Design an enzyme around this catalytic site. Structure first.
Site, mmCIF file in Angstrom:
data_model
loop_
_atom_site.group_PDB
_atom_site.id
_atom_site.type_symbol
_atom_site.label_atom_id
_atom_site.label_comp_id
_atom_site.label_asym_id
_atom_site.label_seq_id
_atom_site.Cartn_x
_atom_site.Cartn_y
_atom_site.Cartn_z
ATOM 1 C CG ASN A 1 -9.906 -4.206 1.560
ATOM 2 O OD1 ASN A 1 -10.959 -3.796 1.111
ATOM 3 N ND2 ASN A 1 -8.795 -3.480 1.521
ATOM 4 C CB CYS B 1 -8.389 0.241 2.974
ATOM 5 S SG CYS B 1 -6.854 0.544 4.021
ATOM 6 C CD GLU C 1 -8.903 -1.091 -0.986
ATOM 7 O OE1 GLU C 1 -9.292 -0.931 0.183
ATOM 8 O OE2 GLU C 1 -7.677 -1.256 -1.221
HETATM 9 N N1 LIG Z 1 -0.109 6.430 3.794
HETATM 10 C C1 LIG Z 1 0.864 5.684 4.325
HETATM 11 N N2 LIG Z 1 0.793 4.331 4.306
HETATM 12 C C2 LIG Z 1 1.771 3.564 4.843
HETATM 13 C C3 LIG Z 1 2.897 4.139 5.438
HETATM 14 N N3 LIG Z 1 3.681 3.147 5.877
HETATM 15 C C4 LIG Z 1 3.087 1.992 5.579
HETATM 16 N N4 LIG Z 1 1.934 2.242 4.948
HETATM 17 C C5 LIG Z 1 0.997 1.191 4.487
HETATM 18 C C6 LIG Z 1 -0.422 1.653 4.078
HETATM 19 C C7 LIG Z 1 -0.951 0.334 3.497
HETATM 20 O O1 LIG Z 1 -1.653 -0.411 4.518
HETATM 21 C C8 LIG Z 1 0.338 -0.424 3.066
HETATM 22 C C9 LIG Z 1 0.359 -0.746 1.590
HETATM 23 O O2 LIG Z 1 0.360 0.469 0.831
HETATM 24 P P1 LIG Z 1 -0.265 0.531 -0.668
HETATM 25 O O3 LIG Z 1 -0.093 1.902 -1.189
HETATM 26 O O4 LIG Z 1 0.180 -0.664 -1.416
HETATM 27 O O5 LIG Z 1 -1.775 0.042 -0.398
HETATM 28 P P2 LIG Z 1 -3.123 0.930 -0.073
HETATM 29 O O6 LIG Z 1 -2.748 2.112 0.760
HETATM 30 O O7 LIG Z 1 -3.798 1.107 -1.398
HETATM 31 O O8 LIG Z 1 -3.952 -0.077 0.926
HETATM 32 P P3 LIG Z 1 -4.497 -1.586 0.610
HETATM 33 O O9 LIG Z 1 -4.002 -1.976 -0.738
HETATM 34 O O10 LIG Z 1 -6.096 -1.385 0.586
HETATM 35 O O11 LIG Z 1 -4.097 -2.422 1.789
HETATM 36 O O12 LIG Z 1 1.439 0.490 3.307
HETATM 37 C C10 LIG Z 1 3.012 5.536 5.479
HETATM 38 O O13 LIG Z 1 3.996 6.077 6.000
HETATM 39 N N5 LIG Z 1 1.978 6.323 4.913
#
Ligand SMILES: Nc1nc2c(ncn2[C@H]2C[C@H](O)[C@@H](COP(=O)(O)OP(=O)(O)OP(=O)(O)O)O2)c(=O)[nH]1
Ligand SMILES: Nc1nc2c(ncn2[C@H]2C[C@H](O)[C@@H](COP(=O)(O)OP(=O)(O)OP(=O)(O)O)O2)c(=O)[nH]1
Ligand SMILES: Nc1nc2c(ncn2[C@H]2C[C@H](O)[C@@H](COP(=O)(O)OP(=O)(O)OP(=O)(O)O)O2)c(=O)[nH]1
Ligand SMILES: Nc1nc2c(ncn2[C@H]2C[C@H](O)[C@@H](COP(=O)(O)OP(=O)(O)OP(=O)(O)O)O2)c(=O)[nH]1
Ligand SMILES: [Mg+2]
Ligand SMILES: [Mg+2]
Lengths: 611, 623
Positions: A310, A312, A314
């Site tokens: 995917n 990212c 993981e």
């Molecule tokens: N770090 C960060 N992520 C953001 C921001 N706005 C939207 N996102 C996005 C990053 C992810 O593609 C999406 C979903 O966040 P999550 O914490 O559920 O998922 P994660 O970062 O573990 O990525 P994934 O589950 O592998 O798609 O939110 C932001 O301001 N900062």
């Protein structure tokens, strides 16, 4: 401590002002006029709990008779851990649980719920009821299959999924096409059509090309300097990591070829590696996807194969497979100098059931996906809060102590998650493909390297038990947790804190407790500029060494932390190898070579100041 | 003259060196290695004649003992008119005929051909055996349908087809999307995805948006250099031309609205026209598609509905329909000051059977297209060499004389084309939707306007007769003929010659380069070779004979090129042929560099009053 007592410690701690902003902004449901249907986290926790508990309607172990009691019990436990923010599922589960359902059924008090109420929730889930973050679709070597994949990207992207593909099936640029005329345009040109499609749908993807593809060099240079801006790009290594390390050490040559082309070429593996490294040095892309290493631990290989991850990194997924994730905040398990393992085991059992239940109430846009998920039931349980937990434990992230800790923690989690999967297979039924998997056909199959914990022998026997019963093909991951860790007010996945004091578009809470105010109020100025404690004199050596940030930690310690966790994770790990601005291309190659010897399943590097 | 006598005059005249380069370049068939399987036009004509004659296997009027003789007879006639270059089908028939078939069957002497040989050809035509130029597919208002259509474009383009769509179903930018709080991006955003798809696949298209769509202004400007660079763009007028003219004349307002949006706007029709005219004056886009006018004459309307054209505008097609084209070189029918109507009739008859036979051997990449084509059997028989014919008859293009002659010539072609469709319907079976068409459910239905010919009453009679038997829903068009007129060494379509002389370069091994002066062959024949050599220099410099001292007045008047002919005289020519064409016409309204935006508007206003079905303008020097 019992989990119910840990819950009572956290359940009434309100999300920070920062967390509440994100929630209002993106998470709380609104009605057809933009009016809030949810105004607090507890509203989100109730809706999510209730919808996922609904899966217990399908539990063959319950009689129609006890179902209502049992359902309400699961709803109640899900609700409590969620509201306490001890575990949070991936974003799509939070955005999209309850889509289609009567508003009056989603937040009604649990004691008032009837069996018919749950049945109606279950039946009213709509086509947008998509609760998984991770997808991989194939891209076959025909115009027909290429553009069917473009449509699949659009549809998955539309419902909130992130999708990855391996483009290697696509014959190289200039290959004969047994049409009239002329020639194949190659993988990279078609990746532009994907980019353009998604750029309009979103008005975040993964693209992999294998190291032995004849257009690999164009690929490596594909985001250099038309990008391709929606793609994360990785080079794929379908062969054994050992084999590539040997070839590099011997200054060997790689044969670039393709089954549907006469295009052939030899390149020095060192040259190609350096080309990869130079671009990663400049801009962070492309990464390395050790696909063979993923397939080494894939229970369904070789009759199914991991070709991509995917966006990212993981989860490595076979074709049409999706995976839903969720993360435990381990910082909340700190108790008087230790990790409260008693409460942790309880939560891991609860987290696994919740993630498995998500599958049953998930709605996907493409039947091939529905089918691949049902047959494997892959889950992605991870952790967040790791770095914050290390601060509480007064342990430096860059230390063997931290890595030995990290490995035992992950081993303990892996042990109880796989034990839970045994338990759920007994209760609910095994994953349909158990019979053809290495848990069944092999002896002593373990889906990860181990080798750094006292728990190994216990893990080895739990893996043997799962010959008979097992709900899920794989269970663990470590995700970026970019948004859910903000919701939980904690550090992201396994990463160290990037900074101790900032202003995201904010002084670390653990530091604010261990640092004497006044020493704090003085330095919080030059902490923000400089971005580390390291060179602030008249802060104690003990605070300095524990309260390290990402760029205090050298590239090797980043990589060895990833290795330690990966030894006990059956899917993959999202980890950035931060490098100082003064790092050279040779430093980057040295990361790659160390990566090849460790148990890591992929690499992402980022050099500070490069972009 | 009998067609046989005409064929013998042309059959041994080989293409010019210019043609042969084009043929080697892209028409002659090659093997998996890159080796030439064809090296002469004759080889292409054998292959194509053979493949299209194979369709007679399916003729329910041949008894089994008849079949092989009958097929060889059709192959032979097809071969002769192709070899003679009196008729040439659209490029995809020439690129793709015989793909999938064993090389030992495509070129072998006909007197070694057995019935089983023909049956093997029929069976082995592969998935790339696509013989039609022109396609329309719908683009419905959903992500699923939008990307299903991106995929059909790629598939159609891959196999050599040119496709168009109307993008008007897509709800305007900013629209509500149910069960979410994000908005629809709009038709023009999605057209970028189609342009991307096709720029890689081709490493043009037709896109139409209707004049009352709320994003029409964005659309008008979509190829404004600030790019949909693979699209031709036209504005769609699904209402009556009359309605739009009246609104313009009243300085009225149009309401822009969509059925799946709450976004409304009122705009002055004159201000919208001027925006279009200004853009077309700058760059040649966008054009006008009078869809309502096409539906006026569509025999299936309203059961079925024309919403778009192909890229060149000359076929209006319903959803999933395709059309195969071909053209007769009418400059070859010049005989002692007259057009040889006896040989021309015979050749129309042959050409309509050929074209209808192509449907039977055609392979489409999409289910719904095979179906739409079987149900309607639309053909596009046209002409090329019309400008060079006027040269031979000494008629100036920019004259009523030329327009009256065009109308009569097109009327004669239409009459015998629709008559053959009649005869073929009795012989082979009617097109499936005959029963529900206006040829059945009406009296006095004629699929074009007429009003400019002595043939009108007989045409009415044949259309009445095809209430009973009719093999095809429509038969005629005039296409650009950009390649096949080059092949036939003649003028393109109904268009005037763009230039009478120019330098082309023949690439050489040791030189290179090199200068190779071309002069129009009829000019060569009529002008004094002594005069020619004097003026040649100024003619290439100036692009016209108009201002050359001491070339006879009658030569300057006959040998006009595109830019000697004023915009209204271009438009009225289009009107003369459209009156006797059931599909549409490809015609560029050339305009002098010194034309203004007001001049372009005036062309659009006059277009609204004539019988044309759409407009393309090109102002010299603009691009
Ligand atoms: N770090 C960060 N992520 C953001 C921001 N706005 C939207 N996102 C996005 C990053 C992810 O593609 C999406 C979903 O966040 P999550 O914490 O559920 O998922 P994660 O970062 O573990 O990525 P994934 O589950 O592998 O798609 O939110 C932001 O301001 N900062
Ligand atoms: N850019 C571009 N690529 C093409 C075209 N036709 C084929 N390709 C590329 C797309 C695929 O990666 C590969 C094979 O495409 P297809 O299977 O659609 O070609 P086809 O089945 O006619 O020939 P095959 O028997 O598979 O060699 O070639 C084309 O017209 N344009
Ligand atoms: N750019 C962009 N356009 C979209 C998105 N979703 C829908 N649209 C546009 C595409 C179509 O012109 C129109 C409708 O899309 P669909 O039929 O796929 O949406 P859906 O069936 O979910 O809702 P509907 O009942 O049609 O409002 O809105 C999107 O996520 N991004
Ligand atoms: N490669 C190449 N293609 C050309 C040239 N001129 C026109 N074409 C393309 C556009 C036509 O759709 C395609 C086939 O040539 P034809 O003479 O059969 O078609 P025509 O120009 O009548 O356009 P149509 O049948 O409406 O697509 O050739 C040229 O000079 N070089
Ligand atoms: Mg193929
Ligand atoms: Mg819809």
């Amino acid at each position: 401590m019992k989990l119910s007592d840990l819950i009572s410690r956290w359940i009434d701690v309100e999300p920070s002002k920062n967390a509440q902003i994100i929630l209002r902004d993106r998470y709380f449901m609104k009605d057809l006029d933009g009016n809030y249907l949810e105004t607090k986290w507890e509203d989100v926790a109730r809706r999510v709990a209730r919808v996922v508990a609904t899966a217990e309607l399908l539990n063959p172990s319950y009689k129609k008779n006890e179902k209502l009691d049992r359902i309400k019990e699961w709803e109640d436990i899900f609700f409590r851990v969620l509201k306490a923010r001890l575990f949070i599922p991936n974003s799509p589960t939070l955005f999209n649980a309850g889509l289609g359902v009567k508003h009056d059924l989603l937040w009604k008090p649990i004691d008032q719920m009837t069996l018919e109420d749950y049945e109606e929730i279950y039946r009213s889930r709509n086509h947008l009821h998509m609760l998984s973050a991770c997808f991989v679709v194939p891209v076959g070597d025909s115009i027909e299959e290429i553009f069917e994949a473009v449509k699949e990207y659009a549809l998955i992207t539309k419902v909130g999924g992130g999708v990855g593909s391996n483009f290697s099936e696509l014959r190289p640029k200039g290959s004969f096409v047994a049409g009239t005329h002329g020639k194949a345009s190659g993988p990279v040109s078609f990746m532009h059509v994907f980019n353009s499609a998604i750029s309009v749908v979103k008005q975040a993807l993964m693209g992999i090309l294998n190291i032995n593809h004849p257009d690999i060099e164009e690929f490596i240079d594909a985001k250099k300097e038309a990008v391709l801006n929606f793609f994360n790009l990785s080079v794929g290594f379908p062969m054994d990591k050992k084999e590539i390390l040997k070839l590099y050490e011997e200054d060997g040559e790689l044969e670039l070829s393709h089954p549907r082309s006469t295009i052939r070429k030899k390149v020095k593996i060192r040259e190609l590696f350096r080309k990869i490294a130079t671009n990663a040095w400049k801009s962070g892309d492309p990464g390395l996807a050790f696909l063979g290493e993923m397939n080494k631990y894939y229970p369904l290989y070789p009759h199914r194969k991991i070709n991509s991850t995917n966006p990212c990194g993981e989860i490595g997924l076979s074709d049409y497979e999706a995976c839903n994730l969720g993360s435990i905040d381990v910082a909340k398990f700190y108790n008087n100098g230790f990790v409260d393992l008693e409460a942790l085991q309880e939560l891991v059992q609860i987290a696994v059931r919740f993630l498995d239940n998500v599958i049953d109430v998930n709605v996907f846009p493409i039947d091939k996906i529905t089918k691949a998920v049902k047959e494997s039931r892959r889950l992605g349980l991870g952790i967040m809060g790791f770095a914050d937990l290390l601060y509480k434990l007064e342990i430096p992230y860059n230390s063997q102590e931290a890595r030995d800790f990290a490995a035992n923690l992950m081993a303990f989690i892996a042990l109880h998650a796989h034990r839970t999967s045994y338990e759920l297979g007994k209760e609910k039924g095994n994953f349909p493909l158990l019979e053809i998997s290495r848990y069944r056909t092999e002896d002593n199959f373990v889906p990860f390297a181990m080798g750094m914990s006292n728990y190994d022998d216990e893990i080895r026997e739990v893996m043997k038990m799962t010959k008979e019963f097992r709900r899920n093909v794989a269970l663990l991951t470590i995700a970026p947790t970019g948004s859910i860790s903000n919701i939980a007010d904690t550090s992201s996945g396994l990463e160290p804190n990037f900074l101790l004091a900032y202003t995201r578009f904010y002084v670390n809470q653990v530091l604010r407790e261990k640092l004497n105010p006044e020493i704090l109020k003085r330095i919080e100025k030059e902490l923000i500029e400089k971005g580390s404690l390291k060179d602030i004199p008249d802060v104690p050596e003990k605070i300095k060494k524990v309260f390290v940030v990402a760029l205090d930690i050298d590239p090797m310690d980043h990589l060895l932390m990833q290795d330690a966790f990966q030894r006990y994770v059956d899917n993959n790990i999202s980890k950035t190898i931060n490098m100082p601005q003064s790092a050279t291309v040779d430093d980057v190659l040295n990361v790659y070579l160390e990566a090849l010897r460790t148990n890591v399943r992929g690499i992402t590097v980022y050099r500070d100041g490069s972009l």
